[PDB]
């Protein structure tokens, strides 16, 4: 059933990700020796504008390893673009720790297989609980400030047809779209690509969504959880 | 290309290319003999202090103590230093003192402008100083006749409660409480809302 995959990643990136249920992303890098480097969704939280100050302090405290800091330097080096450099792998549940760690990922399957999301990153457009829900990973670019720091969200919705979801996203994110137009006018020598990117990975039953806390090195984080989850990857689709 | 300056009532505007101060000093020192020209006794007394050291004498080429003349290099350096007194190249200032001064003055001056062309630019504000300054002078005179001097009345001006230990213009945003209480213009502004 499930399509297992296998990756290697150095110890510095692992310690908070080591909880079995996690989500993993692959990042390209211009540096020749680390051609690719593997980053979990939690590590994006240290830079995500949506994450609150306390959770950002915790993330800064945890990921102090030199390799992880170099990874964040590579991430921040990217000029106003991340989806050109980020690629989604899927959900993982197995880990062996060491000087170089081993973990497996599933790119298509539904074989506990809970997927974990940080509480800061989670939003829903609807408070009514639909019986069937899809979940998506979206990246949104802020433009009203001096330079673009990105926003990160993982959201659940009962909408499947893409254009309807883009309509509702436009409705809720009108400020970001106006900010994108403002960026285009205010700095004409610079040309941003999109306001946000939608990517699809989700099939789950809404009655199996949980709220929970997570611990690492006696540091405490608040998270939201999808329990009876199935993973189906998709293409990074750009919207305005 | 040209620069026109005509501040004199009875003289037409001067015509120089660029760097008016340096151009004027160089032209006045070159076209006419500058040996006979003697500056004030303040410059003469400064000349003694400059001559008393060998390195400074070499730098400024001040050879004669008794002579009242002042070399071009000393005057140019003094003028450059005086110009540099306000602007510091270490940190880029957002706006010049004239901009903030015009804002603080025109915050009171807005009442009369509604009877005239509303200025959206600084230049229109600059063009109305002869018609705006008399009101400021009148209100300053009224405040002078009005203040009782709750603060130390040794002098009536701004920046008087400076901490003796602090010796920097820049804040170490943070402002020491009561730093500007002694100024009377800020008192008038606060009274007027």
């Amino acid at each position: 059933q499930a399509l297992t995959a296998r990756f290697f990643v150095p110890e510095g990136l692992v310690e908070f990700e080591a909880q079995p249920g996690a989500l993993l992303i692959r990042m390209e890098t211009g540096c020749d020796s680390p051609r690719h480097l593997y980053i979990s969704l939690y590590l994006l939280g240290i830079r995500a504008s949506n994450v609150s100050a306390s959770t950002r302090c915790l993330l800064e405290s945890v990921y102090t390893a030199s390799a992880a800091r170099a990874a964040l330097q590579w991430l921040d080096l990217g000029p106003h673009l991340l989806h050109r450099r980020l690629e989604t792998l899927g959900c993982v549940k197995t880990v062996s720790l060491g000087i170089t760690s081993l973990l497996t990922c599933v790119m298509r399957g539904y074989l506990v297989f809970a997927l974990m999301i940080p509480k800061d990153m989670y939003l829903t457009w609807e408070e009514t609980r639909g019986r069937l829900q899809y979940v998506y990973l979206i990246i949104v670019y802020d433009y009203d400030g001096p330079e673009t720091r990105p926003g990160i969200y993982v959201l659940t919705s009962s909408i499947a047809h893409w254009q309807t979801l883009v309509d509702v996203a436009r409705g809720k994110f009108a400020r970001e779209r106006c900010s994108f137009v403002n960026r285009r006018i205010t700095r004409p020598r610079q040309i941003p690509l999109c306001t946000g990117v939608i990517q699809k990975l989700g099939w789950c039953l809404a009655d199996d969504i949980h709220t929970s806390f997570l611990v690492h090195k006696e540091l405490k984080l608040s998270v939201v959880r999808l329990d009876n989850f199935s993973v189906e990857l998709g293409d990074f689709r750009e919207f305005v | 290309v040209p620069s026109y300056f005509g501040i004199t009532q009875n003289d037409p505007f001067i015509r120089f290319h660029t760097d008016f101060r340096g151009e004027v000093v160089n032209t006045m020192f070159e076209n006419a003999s500058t040996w006979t020209f003697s500056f004030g006794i303040w410059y003469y007394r400064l000349k003694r202090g400059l001559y008393t050291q060998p390195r400074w004498k070499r730098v400024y080429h001040l050879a004669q103590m008794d002579n009242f003349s002042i070399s071009q290099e000393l005057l140019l350096g003094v003028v450059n230093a005086l110009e540099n007194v306000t602007v510091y190249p270490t940190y880029d200032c957002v706006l010049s003192d004239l901009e903030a001064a015009a804002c603080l003055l025109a915050a009171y001056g807005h009442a009369l402008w509604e009877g005239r062309d509303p200025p959206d630019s600084v230049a229109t504000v600059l063009g109305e100083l002869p018609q705006l300054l008399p009101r400021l002078a009148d209100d300053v005179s009224r405040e002078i006749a009005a203040w009782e001097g709750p603060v130390a009345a040794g002098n009536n001006y701004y920046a008087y409660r400076d901490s003796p230990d602090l010796r920097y213009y820049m804040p170490l945003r943070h402002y020491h409480p009561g730093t500007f209480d002694r100024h009377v213009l800020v008192r008038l502004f606060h009274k007027r809302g």
């Binding site: 019986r131 285009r184 999109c194 | -």
Partner: protein, 292 residues
């Protein structure tokens, strides 16, 4: 996953109705809730169709819903099968549109056709069964594009000028057939679509490079052909070494132009639901791959 859907008829099943429904086996019907058991009311578009209100609203309501296939029936029981992405299935042509080998399919609300005497299926009391239209890509894309054109043109014009343009636009000819859009009334959904279209159109107008701006002028000066003559005839009412050439900036600008044009295309292209293998020669049935 709920790989099967059961639906129960509350009304009695006369022999004629059950035979007619037996002829419909392996056709396509939509289901809103995906729940395991569903009543007979939600089977079909009759609960939601309303000629008083927008065809745009019905288009959205249809594109949002889920698709299912039909299975053989029994007393008071009708069985619906949900397709799985990537597998191979048999579907029957619900509409009169011709189907051809090797082109994609889309789902759209029903359209007016020549005789206007649409056959009625399972008219149980005041309720009726109505099927959606499965349409090959060119016709569906053309009709959605022309509906958006209707919305963009008709705005802020009197009925008199609009009257000729709507009779020119509403009629679609496709592979020897003729069709007409039922009720193209402007709706808030169409206004949102038009706002997005205007924003994207202005953005591509702005960020387009100089070479892209001046390309057709230079080539019309250089060459002369029927296509260029038509383009000039269109632009006639509107009608040297580049001082800057920069490959990297040109690459980035064209990437922005592609994201803009990609966005503008999404307003028109309905999501694919079926890709076909070769079709039976009677144009009534075909074997297709299902996509979600």
């Amino acid at each position: 996953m709920e790989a099967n859907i059961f639906c129960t008829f509350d009304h009695k099943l006369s022999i004629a109705d059950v035979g007619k429904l037996t002829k419909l086996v392996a056709a396509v019907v939509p289901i809103p809730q995906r729940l395991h058991l569903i009543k007979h009311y939600q089977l079909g578009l009759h609960q939601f169709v309303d000629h008083t209100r927008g065809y745009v609203r019905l288009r959205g309501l249809l594109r949002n819903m889920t698709l299912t296939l039909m299975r053989r029936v029994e007393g008071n029981q009708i069985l619906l099968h949900v397709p799985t992405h990537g597998l191979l299935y048999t579907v029957l042509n619900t509409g009169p549109v011709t189907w051809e080998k090797g082109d994609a399919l889309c789902v759209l609300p029903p359209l007016f056709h020549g005789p206007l005497a649409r056959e009625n299926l399972l008219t149980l009391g005041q309720w009726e069964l109505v099927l959606p239209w499965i349409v090959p890509m060119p016709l569906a894309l053309e009709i959605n594009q022309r509906l958006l054109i209707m919305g963009l043109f008709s705005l802020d014009r009197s009925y008199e000028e609009v009257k000729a343009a709507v009779q020119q636009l509403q009629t679609i000819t496709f592979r020897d057939a003729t069709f007409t859009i039922p009720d193209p009334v402007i709706d808030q959904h169409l206004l949102i679509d038009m706002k997005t279209a205007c924003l994207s159109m202005s953005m591509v107008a702005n960020l387009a490079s100089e070479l892209t701006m001046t390309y057709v002028r230079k080539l019309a000066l250089e060459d002369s052909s029927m296509l260029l003559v038509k383009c000039q005839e269109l632009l006639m009412r509107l009608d040297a070494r580049p001082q800057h050439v920069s490959p990297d900036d040109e690459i980035a600008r064209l990437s922005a132009l592609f994201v803009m044009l990609r966005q503008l295309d999404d307003l028109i292209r309905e999501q694919v639901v079926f890709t076909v293998c070769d079709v039976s020669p009677d144009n009534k049935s075909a074997t297709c791959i299902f996509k979600g």
